[PDB]
């Protein structure tokens, strides 16, 4: 199911320390050990993909960590907190959340998230 993508293709690459797969309702379909995106944080992110405005001035929360919004559009939402950050990408039916920390190059983490997203969109997800 989606848990393979979280364990192998996302956290397994060592490019992200935490990750989850959400449906468009903001609910979790698969999450890494201990990573918990509350449905409310999930729904807040899911809507941001339509109306980013509410997320731009005050950022957004994800599992107890608050991030400032760097860029947000119809496909991806990037945020950060010092040297940590998260790449969130929307596919046709899900939302990929990939968190990284100060030991990971943000560019390396965007490469993995944006491309897995491209791969699932290609499979029709």
Instruction: Give resolution in angstroms.
Output: 2.5
d(CA 99, CA 102): 11
Annotate the chain with three-state secondary structure. Answer: CHHHHHHHHHHHHCCCCEEEEEECCCCEEEECCCCCCCHHHHHHHHHHCCCCHHHHCCCEEECCEEEEEEEECCCEEEEEECCEEEEEEECCCEEEEEEECCCCCHHHHHHHHHHHHHHHHHHCC
In words, the CATH class of domain 1-125 is alpha beta
d(CA 124, CA 122): 5
Method for this entry? X-ray
Largest pairwise CA distance in the chain: 36
d(CA 58, CA 107): 24
């Amino acid at each position: 199911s989606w848990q393979t993508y979280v364990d192998t293709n996302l956290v397994g690459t060592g490019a992200v320390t935490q990750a989850a797969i959400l449906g468009l309702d903001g609910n979790t379909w698969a999450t890494s050990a201990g990573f918990a995106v509350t449905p409310a944080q999930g729904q807040t992110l899911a809507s941001a993909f339509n109306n980013a405005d509410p997320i731009r001035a005050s950022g957004f929360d994800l599992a107890g960590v608050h991030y400032v919004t760097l860029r947000a559009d119809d496909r991806s939402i990037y945020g950060k907190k010092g040297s940590a950050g998260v790449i969130t990408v929307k596919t046709s039916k899900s939302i990929l959340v990939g968190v990284y920390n100060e030991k990971i190059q943000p560019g390396t983490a965007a490469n993995v998230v944006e491309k897995l997203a491209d791969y699932l969109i290609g499979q029709g997800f």
